[PDB]
């Protein structure tokens, strides 16, 4: 049993995975697909074992029978005595971010503006904001709400992809993987930073991690936190320090999923793999770190301190929470219970 097949989304994740594979002595090997959905299909077919997923994708995976295994745990300030692996996860803050200089833009004036989304089907980038917008407008036409968008995974010729940029060669426009310039947390924040969009749907951490010298990347080098504002549901604008009083939702952390017949073994191997290449890993600062990919968030989020045990051996619904599961199901009616594949 002792060989885990990890699924990588896109060529950049594939490269990192290959490095991990070499360093793990082939205890981990690599399968690769173009999209997260395609990776879930590989796992369902038994052609890969596992991958780490945003909550929106956990919903897709879970409807198809895949189970949560371990969750991303970032650094916190509660349960400080417990080991990271045993410390309870605290979830992240889904936010809507704008430029301070874009004065008078509020939650209530988002119609017909330009939006930047992590990807279709993702928690902070899509399910939360679009679910909120569908409810408030009483309309399923979320594809006509914003004048233009970058929402990787949408129809490339549609307005929802109009702001996406693709790769260096301008290939792979609006593809839901790291090849797309504006993909994921960092890509969506870049879309806002460069004024391609008026609003970015990301998480609190993303803003902090890419401002005030935290990034060094060419587009982020010079970005200041005070130049950004958060949009609150009450129509107010707040500095990015008040994320706890001005968010769209609290999201369940990204988590590893696998088939239930492989979950126990995937868990065993990963706990060992992070002991070697995780935050305080025996071979991280010397050979390879599993949670570092130059602010690109490949395979895992770069802010992951460890993968933590779940406890309560939760179903995918228990992991996501009944509050969030029903929120997706209400949004999915616009696009009742079955596997998508
Ligand atoms: C978009 O609107 C949806 C419909 O109003 C809404 O779904 C509703 O969510 C609430 C709260 O999560 C559910 O009410 C629940 O209230 C308590 C929670 O403790 C439970 O005891 C009840 O059993 C009940 O589940 C509604 O049932 C649910 N409505 C429907 C028809 O599914 C979404 O939350 C809204 N989406 C967003 C993103 O806000
Ligand atoms: C919004 O996201 C921010 C980025 O994740 C986050 O700020 C981070 O908060 C932690 C503590 O919660 C800080 O603490 C770290 O640094 C100290 C020493 O400097 C260490 O002792 C800790 O172990 C820990 O590593 C981070 O420095 C800080 N990150 C940055 C770059 O500012 C906010 O807390 C988030 N806001 C909300 C409301 O959740
Ligand atoms: O919903 C019933 C179900 O809840 C489970 O707790 C949840 C889940 O496992 C956690 O990952 C999640 O963490 C947070 C999430 O962002 C959001 O739900 C928020 O409201 O709360 C957390 C952050 O404050 O919490 C979920 C419950 O809120 C239980 O583990 C499970 O036993 C129960 O059946
Ligand atoms: C690859 O996996 C094997 C099997 O788990 C590892 O070998 C084990 O090492 C552990 C931890 O030090 C010991 O408890 C076991 O006795 C070993 N088992 C066997 C059968 O070899 C190995 O350490 C892993 N290698 C890497 C680099 O990940
Ligand atoms: Fe997410
Ligand atoms: Zn809240
Ligand atoms: Zn349970």
Bridge partners for 290 per DSSP? none
Q: 3-state secondary structure string, the chain? A: CCCEEEEEEHHHHHHHHHHHHHHCCCCEEEEEECCHHHHHHHHHHCCCCEEEECHHHHHHHHHCCCEEEEEEEECCCCCCCCCCCCCCCCCEEEEEEEECCCCCCCHHHCCCCEEEECCCCCHHHHHHHHHHHHHHHCCCCCCCCCCEEECCCCCCCCHHHCCCCCCCCCCCCCCCCCCCCCCHHHHHHHHHHCCCCCEEEEEHHHHHHCCCCCCCCCCCCCCCHHHEEEECCCCCEECCCCCCCCCCEEECCCEEEECCCCHHHHHHHHHHHHHHHCCCCCCCCCCCCCCCCCCCCCCCCCCEEEEEECCCCCCHHHHHCHHHHHHHHHHCCCCCCCCCC
- Sign of the alpha-carbon torsion through 328, 95, 13, 278: negative
Per-residue tokens: 333: 């009616």
The residue contributing the CA closest to ligand 4 atom 11 is 272
249 vs 247: CA distance, rounded Å: 6
Per-residue tokens: 30: 């690599």
Instruction: State how far the alpha carbon of 336 is from the alpha carbons of 63, 142, 321, 327, 330, in Å.
Output: 11, 20, 18, 13, 10
> Which residue in 334, 266, 317, 300 sits closest to 59, CA to CA?
317
Ligand nearest to the CA of 270: 4
Burial class of 193 by CB neighbour count within 10 A (0 to 12, 13 to 18, 19+): buried
Bind-site residues: 54, 92, 118, 122, 124-125, 185, 254
The residue contributing the CA closest to ligand 1 atom 23 is 322
Q: Where are the domains of the chain?
A: 2-73+255-316, 74-254+317-327
> To test the ligand 3 pocket, which listed residue (243, 250, 321, 325) has its Cβ within 8 A of the most ligand atoms?
321
**Given the structure tokens 């697909």, which residue do they identify?**
33
Question: Is residue 306 within 8 Å of residue 278, measured between CB atoms?
Answer: yes
Experimental method: X-ray
Q: How far is the CA of 254 from the centre of ligand 4 (A)?
A: 27
Bridge partners for 4 per DSSP? 28
Indicate if 74-254+317-327 has the same CATH topology as 2-73+255-316.
Answer: yes
Bridge partners for 214 per DSSP? none
Question: Is residue 333 within 8 Å of residue 140, measured between CB atoms?
Answer: yes
Q: What length is written for the chain?
A: 341
The residue contributing the CA closest to ligand 3 atom 15 is 252
Pairing of strands 255-258, 67-74: antiparallel
> To test the ligand 2 pocket, which listed residue (77, 87, 205) has its Cβ within 8 A of the most ligand atoms?
205
Give domain 2-73+255-316's CATH number out of 3.40.250.10, 3.40.190.10, 3.30.2080.10, 1.10.3720.10. 3.40.190.10
* CATH fold group of domain 74-254+317-327: D-Maltodextrin-Binding Protein; domain 2 (3.40.190)
């Amino acid at each position: 049993y002792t060989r885990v097949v990890w699924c990588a989304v896109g060529p950049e994740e594939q490269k990192k995975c290959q490095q991990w594979s070499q360093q793990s002595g082939q205890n981990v090997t690599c399968a690769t697909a173009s999209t997260t959905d395609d990776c879930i299909v590989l796992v369902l077919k038994g052609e890969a074992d596992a991958l780490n997923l945003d909550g929106g994708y956990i919903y897709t995976a879970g409807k198809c029978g895949l189970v949560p295994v371990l969750a991303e745990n970032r650094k916190s300030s509660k349960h400080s005595s417990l080991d990271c692996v045993l410390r309870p996860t605290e979830g992240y803050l889904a936010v809507a971010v704008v430029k301070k200089a874009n004065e008078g833009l509020t939650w209530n004036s988002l119609k017909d503006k330009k939006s930047c989304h992590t990807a279709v089907d993702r928690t902070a980038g899509w399910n939360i904001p679009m679910g909120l917008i569908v409810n408030q407008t009483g309309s399923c036409a979320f594809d006509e709400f914003f004048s233009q968008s970058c929402a990787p995974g949408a129809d490339p010729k549609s307005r929802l992809c109009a702001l996406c940029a693709g790769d260096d060669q301008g290939l792979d426009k609006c593809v839901p993987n790291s090849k797309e310039k504006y993909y994921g947390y960092t890509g969506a924040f870049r879309c806002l930073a460069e004024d391609v969009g008026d609003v970015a749907f990301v998480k609190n951490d993303t803003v902090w991690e890419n401002t005030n010298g935290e990034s060094t990347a060419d587009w982020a080098k010079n970005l200041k936190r005070e130049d950004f504002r958060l949009l609150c549901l009450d129509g107010t604008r707040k500095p990015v320090t008040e994320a706890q009083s001005c968010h769209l939702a609290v999201a369940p952390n990204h988590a590893v999923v696998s088939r239930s017949d492989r979950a126990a073994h995937v868990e065993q191997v990963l706990l060992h793999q992070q002991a070697l290449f995780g935050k305080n890993g025996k071979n991280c600062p010397d050979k390879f770190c599993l949670f570092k990919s130059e602010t690109k968030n490949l395979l895992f989020n770069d802010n992951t301190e460890c993968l933590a045990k779940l406890g309560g051996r939760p179903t995918y619904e228990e992991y996501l929470g009944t509050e969030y599961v029903t929120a997706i199901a209400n949004l999915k009616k616009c696009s009742l219970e079955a596997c998508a594949f």
